[PDB]
């Protein structure tokens, strides 16, 4: 087994930057057989460079593979707003194979602070005995941050999972929505619902304070 | 030309990482002096001493530089300076080490190693080049390339690719 | 060109087995290595194994060997994959992919790379049965707002506000394989506070196997 | 020198599975077309599909699909037949086949048709349990006589008369499949009516599933 291990992190580059990736493996693939696979979520993962050197008819020339032996290389000179996705490479050498680890390239604006909000649980689901306290992190950059809820003066981890959108191409920022599940009888008790969010832009953990009643 | 003939075959792996150290072009292109002037002379002299000696040397070089091309033709190696064969290293009794041969042994000492059985190897090579390989290739066409592959008796193709 | 119209996504009881199809169209069903790949819904990609229909050469998986079955039936010109022991960690998208060839066609020398592909369907096992959820006004210069499509079955729903008239500034959030046997979803947009009573923000949801598409008020 | 080493006989139930083997002692085995052909007693060679051990190329007979399990092994020099989900009509001699070779040798071009065989393996699939043979002698112008062996299960019975001395008139029959699935046999020894009194005529029946070697001297 050849554990293919590409290793740049988030390729947070500006539109128009040289998208150079690490693109290595555990050991050397036989006969340099590597294919280059662009991928978008929900679409077809598409071949770029077959044999890691030659490109088919129809694939754009700005895709360009290089390297040999154990670790290959992909460079992309111009960064278009549609190529900002996750990139992999995959061996067709030894009879067993695995794909790339995952490198996301994005639109790069500067670092920023959000407009934080939290939703109280709605009465329409509270009358069924199902509370849901939902935070919101609107128009922040970068995506990577941390969310520490204070539900009755305590840390929560296991009920408030996180749903985070990718970089919306209009505003070039991200959006987070953490959602904790609860019931109505606990909603009659809990007064503190304050997600203490930490970020480059959220240096101090702020709240949008509300209690049981609004 | 001949520039590392005294080196070991590992340092004469250097020779065949270049044009066998220029041996073949020195075979045919050292003719260029007697190619440049067997004819620049405009003199009568009524008789010729070199008219037999130079001519005998010339056609001797030509027949020697064609016997080897025909012998590479007879082992399917025509054109290729370095080619491999289906003849195995047989019961031939100079069985020894790989890291002894291609690291510490010159070409001349290697010729002194296998000075015997060399005509045995030369007779042996064309056997696997022809008597079954040419007959397998003659088999390989008297079957449709894309029509036999339905039988599930596809090994014949596999048999022709392993043995 | 080469079209690989995969069969649709499926729901099924866990612990049982599963079959999927991949009907090719164009090029050649045989003489080129059709194969099969995975990707967990959020992970990178993963190759499993393939088949070559003219000689039924099966090149199977390093780990899933013994539980995978790939066939090739050229007489009706399809290709099936049969996995077993359905489970929440068999949940991945399963793309069917064919090897491409040199030149613009489907007959010349192959390349060794997964050039032409198929649409793919997420092969996700089902725990519960269907469920129509309820949609809520999530109360907050700029008033935040959401329509929580929470604890339903099955995935997915979409969210469009005022029948898609409000189109910019949208921020949906993906459905979750959560810890209740159901599925939840969130979706927010950005409106001002002063236009609460003037413009009534009415999200529209589309849950197609549970059949609930209601207009829902947001007037916090 | 392609020689084939099978396994030993077995008694089983329907629905279970039997791993019978064919170890290739000698001969180029990994690249040649093995076949697994059984023969029910007195009928045609029932082909159950072969295998090439080089890339696991299982040419299947299209009538035993789903019930077959055919693999290969180069290290043990053995292809494995695994007839899962057995039936009582599987009672057959599980021969293992392998194609020949042009020549003049055992390494050249293959010919397709099977040349080499194993020792033959028998399955006796029945839910009746193992029994021991009970012989019952026929009492003696001549008047022939034998020994009725019965109440043995499974097959076979190996009768002996005078420890193999009287070798004429030992009409050796196959055991007939009786009404209750049982079997019977009588090697009826023909002797004249001049020595009906004293001379030894013993029926020694050995049955290796039972390991009972019954001795029985006949008497008028
Ligand atoms: C001669 O042999 C020595 C080994 O001691 C080596 O270093 C040197 O390169 C050789 N010379 C040539 C011309 O190959
Ligand atoms: C081959 O020969 C070298 C000496 O030239 C020696 O060091 C090495 O151990 C030999 N290898 C074997 C396998 O005999
Ligand atoms: C290796 O080569 C050197 C010089 O070429 C020689 O002196 C030495 O004896 C050689 N050793 C062997 C084991 O061939
Ligand atoms: C090689 O052939 C010659 C013939 O000239 C012979 O004398 C010698 O013994 C042979 N064997 C060797 C050098 O091992």
């Amino acid at each position: 087994e050849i554990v293919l291990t590409q290793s740049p992190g988030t390729q947070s580059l500006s539109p128009g930057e040289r998208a150079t990736l690490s693109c290595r493996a555990s050991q050397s693939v036989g006969n340099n057989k590597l294919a280059w696979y662009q991928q978008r979520p929900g679409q077809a993962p598409r071949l770029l460079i077959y044999g890691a050197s030659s490109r088919p008819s129809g694939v754009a020339d700005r895709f360009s593979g290089s390297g040999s032996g154990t670790d290959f290389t992909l460079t992309i000179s111009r960064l278009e707003p549609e190529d900002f996705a996750v990139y992999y490479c995959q061996q067709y050498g030894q009879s067993l194979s695995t794909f790339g680890q995952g490198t996301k390239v994005e639109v790069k604006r500067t670092v920023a602070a959000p407009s934080v909000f939290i939703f109280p649980p709605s009465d329409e689901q509270l009358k069924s005995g199902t509370a849901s306290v939902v935070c919101l992190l609107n128009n922040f950059y970068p995506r990577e941050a941390k969310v520490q809820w204070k539900v009755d003066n305590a840390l929560q981890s296991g009920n408030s999972q996180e749903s985070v959108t990718e970089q919306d191409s209009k505003d070039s920022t991200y959006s987070l929505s953490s959602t904790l599940t609860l019931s109505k009888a606990d909603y009659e008790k809990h007064k503190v619902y304050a997600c203490e969010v930490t970020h480059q832009g959220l240096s101090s953990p702020v709240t949008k304070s509300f209690n049981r009643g609004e | 030309f001949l520039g590392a003939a005294g080196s070991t075959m590992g340092a004469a792996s250097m020779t065949l990482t270049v044009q066998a150290r220029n041996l073949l072009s020195g075979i045919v292109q050292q003719q260029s002096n007697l190619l440049r002037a067997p004819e620049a002379q405009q003199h009568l002299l009524k008789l010729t001493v070199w008219g037999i000696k130079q001519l005998q040397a010339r056609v001797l070089a030509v027949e020697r530089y064609l016997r080897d091309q025909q012998l590479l033709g007879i082992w399917g190696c025509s054109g290729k300076l370095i080619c491999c064969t289906n003849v195995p290293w047989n019961s031939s009794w100079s069985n020894r080490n790989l890291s002894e041969i291609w690291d510490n042994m010159t070409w001349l000492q290697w010729d002194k190693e296998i000075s015997n059985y060399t005509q045995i190897i030369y007779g042996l090579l064309e056997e696997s080049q022809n008597q079954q390989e040419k007959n397998e290739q003659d088999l390989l066409a008297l079957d449709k390339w894309a029509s036999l592959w339905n039988w599930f008796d596809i090994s014949n193709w596999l048999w022709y690719i392993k043995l | 060109q080469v079209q690989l119209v995969q069969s649709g996504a499926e729901v099924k009881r866990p612990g049982s087995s599963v079959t999927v199809s991949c009907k090719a169209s164009g090029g050649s069903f045989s003489t080129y290595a059709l194969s099969w790949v995975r990707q967990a819904p959020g992970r990178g990609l993963e190759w499993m194994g393939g088949v070559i229909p003219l000689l039924t050469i099966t090149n199977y998986a390093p780990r899933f060997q013994g539980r995978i079955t790939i066939t090739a039936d050229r007489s009706t010109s399809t290709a099936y994959l049969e996995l077993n022991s359905l489970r929440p960690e068999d949940t991945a998208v399963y793309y069917c992919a064919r090897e491409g060839t040199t030149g613009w066609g489907w007959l010349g020398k192959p390349i060794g790379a997964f050039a032409h592909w198929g649409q793919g369907t997420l092969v996700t096992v089902s725990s519960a049965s269907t469920k129509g959820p309820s949609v809520f006004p999530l109360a907050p210069g700029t008033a935040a707002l959401g329509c929580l499509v929470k604890d339903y079955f099955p995935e997915p729903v979409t969210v469009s506000w005022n029948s898609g008239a409000l189109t910019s500034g949208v921020h949906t959030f993906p459905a979750v394989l959560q810890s209740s046997g159901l599925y939840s979803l969130s979706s927010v947009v950005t409106v001002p506070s002063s236009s609460l009573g003037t413009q009534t923000y009415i999200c529209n949801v589309n849950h197609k196997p549970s059949n609930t598409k209601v207009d829902k008020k947001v007037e916090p």
Side-chain angles (χ1 to χ4, degrees), chain A, chain B residues 1-64 66-141 143 146 150 153, chain C residues 2-105 107-220:
Chain A
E1 179 182 318
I2 310 188
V3 177
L4 194 146
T5 177
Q6 75 184 38
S7 72
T10 294
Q11 197 68 222
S12 171
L13 301 190
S14 44
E17 208 154 344
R18 206 189 198 89
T20 78
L21 318 175
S22 179
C23 294
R24 231 66 248 225
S26 53
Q27 67 180 358
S28 186
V29 61
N31 304 123
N32 79 91
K33 320 241 244 61
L34 193 86
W36 283 98
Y37 289 117
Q38 198 268 333
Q39 175 264 338
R40 284 185 211 85
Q43 315 180 18
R46 186 161 23 97
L47 168 62
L48 309 164
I49 316 292
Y50 69 98
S53 43
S54 169
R55 189 187 75 254
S57 178
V59 192
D61 212 358
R62 64 162 177 268
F63 294 107
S64 168
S66 43
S68 76
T70 302
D71 264 76
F72 292 82
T73 317
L74 176 85
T75 198
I76 296 160
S77 315
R78 192 49 173 84
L79 269 177
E80 285 290 325
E82 76 275 359
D83 264 343
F84 288 131
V86 191
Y87 281 77
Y88 319 109
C89 83
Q90 185 269 331
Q91 41 190 343
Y92 68 104
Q94 191 271 328
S95 278
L96 312 171
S97 178
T98 293
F99 278 79
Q101 298 309 306
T103 290
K104 176 192 198 300
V105 58
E106 67 186 25
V107 176
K108 184 160 211 62
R109 68 138 292 178
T110 43
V111 287
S115 66
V116 195
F117 297 97
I118 176 165
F119 303 137
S122 69
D123 305 359
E124 284 178 318
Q125 214 185 38
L126 275 163
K127 73 216 187 194
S128 177
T130 24
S132 187
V133 192
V134 193
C135 227
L136 179 57
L137 211 70
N138 169 50
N139 274 47
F140 67 104
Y141 199 88
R143 188 210 169 277
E144 302 157 358
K146 189 174 178 66
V147 167
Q148 298 205 25
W149 285 72
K150 279 194 59 188
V151 168
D152 201 64
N153 318 307
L155 281 73
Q156 325 298 325
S157 43
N159 216 5
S160 178
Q161 290 178 308
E162 271 71 30
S163 44
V164 179
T165 305
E166 204 260 332
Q167 189 174 26
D168 193 81
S169 278
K170 321 164 193 179
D171 58 356
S172 72
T173 43
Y174 300 87
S175 315
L176 173 142
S177 160
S178 179
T179 316
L180 193 146
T181 319
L182 217 52
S183 169
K184 192 203 168 187
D186 185 342
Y187 163 84
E188 319 195 320
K189 314 203 312 302
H190 272 177
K191 204 86 169 171
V192 177
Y193 318 87
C195 353
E196 303 307 292
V197 193
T198 70
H199 195 216
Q200 162 63 45
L202 262 177
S203 179
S204 169
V206 311
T207 183
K208 291 305 167 185
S209 75
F210 80 101
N211 309 320
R212 38 181 193 96
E214 61 95 18
Chain B
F1 190 59
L2 271 296
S7 84
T8 174
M9 275 176 293
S13 286
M14 224 289 310
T15 60
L16 26 112
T17 52
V18 72
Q19 200 262 319
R21 190 61 180 173
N22 221 332
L23 259 293
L24 164 93
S25 224
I27 282 177
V28 282
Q29 301 296 333
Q30 230 192 268
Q31 296 154 28
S32 196
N33 352 2
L34 68 166
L35 264 285
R36 265 179 297 261
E39 69 27 284
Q41 51 185 1
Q42 178 254 308
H43 314 297
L44 301 174
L45 272 165
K46 304 308 175 358
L47 275 197
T48 41
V49 46
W50 323 109
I52 305 298
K53 235 187 25 192
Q54 278 195 21
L55 263 296
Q56 273 166 324
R58 211 181 271 198
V59 304
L60 205 48
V62 159
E63 289 172 296
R64 217 161 150 278
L66 279 183
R67 276 183 170 151
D68 297 332
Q69 309 290 337
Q70 176 263 0
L71 270 193
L72 258 66
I74 210 168
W75 306 321
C77 203
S78 1
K80 325 198 346 13
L81 300 180
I82 303 173
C83 80
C84 0
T85 46
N86 291 333
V87 163
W89 179 268
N90 65 94
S91 73
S92 211
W93 295 272
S94 53
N95 315 272
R96 58 154 79 260
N97 177 3
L98 219 2
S99 157
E100 176 204 356
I101 287 170
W102 282 98
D103 290 282
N104 198 329
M105 187 169 286
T106 73
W107 269 112
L108 305 149
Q109 294 152 345
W110 180 248
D111 289 345
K112 292 168 185 176
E113 285 296 316
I114 48 168
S115 332
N116 286 256
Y117 321 108
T118 312
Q119 70 283 3
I120 294 169
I121 293 304
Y122 294 155
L124 191 66
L125 285 182
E126 140 251 350
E127 301 160 11
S128 83
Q129 205 268 332
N130 183 272
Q131 321 201 341
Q132 359 12 343
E133 175 184 0
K134 207 26 65 171
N135 291 313
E136 280 173 351
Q137 206 282 323
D138 262 347
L139 300 154
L140 203 73
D143 7 8
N150 289 337
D153 303 343
Chain C
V2 176
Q3 311 303 313
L4 308 187
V5 188
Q6 205 171 295
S7 178
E10 197 172 14
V11 306
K12 190 63 65 67
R13 297 288 193 186
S16 84
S17 296
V18 69
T19 182
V20 294
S21 168
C22 174
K23 171 189 296 288
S25 159
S28 315
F29 313 92
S30 66
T31 186
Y32 285 114
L34 190 136
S35 299
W36 283 86
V37 287
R38 280 182 89 201
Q39 182 200 37
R43 291 197 176 185
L45 283 174
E46 173 195 17
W47 166 84
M48 321 175 79
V51 73
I52 301 174
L54 194 51
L55 287 81
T56 185
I57 316 294
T58 52
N59 41 9
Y60 282 167
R63 161 192 140 177
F64 315 97
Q65 175 162 5
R67 207 175 61 186
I68 53 172
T69 301
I70 316 183
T71 178
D73 202 282
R74 318 159 279 146
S75 277
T76 175
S77 88
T78 51
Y80 305 87
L81 175 61
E82 307 98 277
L83 303 103
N84 311 267
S85 179
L86 278 171
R87 50 184 64 172
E89 48 267 4
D90 268 335
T91 56
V93 73
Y94 279 64
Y95 276 76
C96 74
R98 232 211 73 189
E99 176 195 23
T101 178
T102 77
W104 294 356
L107 202 144
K109 169 184 168 181
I111 52 178
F114 287 175
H116 319 281
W117 277 70
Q119 91 175 6
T121 56
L122 75 173
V123 184
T124 299
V125 65
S126 44
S127 277
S129 278
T130 188
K131 202 265 171 179
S134 162
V135 174
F136 325 109
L138 311 177
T142 310
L145 73 164
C147 276
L148 211 62
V149 191
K150 168 166 161 37
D151 281 326
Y152 56 78
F153 194 87
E155 49 260 325
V157 317
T158 197
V159 166
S160 296
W161 302 75
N162 294 343
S163 199
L166 174 149
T167 309
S168 303
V170 297
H171 288 323
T172 182
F173 308 96
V176 54
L177 177 54
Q178 64 193 334
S179 309
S180 72
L182 279 298
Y183 312 119
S184 170
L185 191 139
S186 319
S187 280
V188 308
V189 284
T190 78
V191 310
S193 282
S194 77
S195 288
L196 189 149
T198 66
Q199 163 64 226
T200 301
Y201 321 106
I202 305 178
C203 57
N204 309 81
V205 292
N206 292 85
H207 198 174
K208 59 187 77 65
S210 294
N211 300 135
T212 168
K213 293 97 182 180
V214 66
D215 64 307
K216 186 59 197 181
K217 61 95 177 178
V218 176
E219 292 180 353

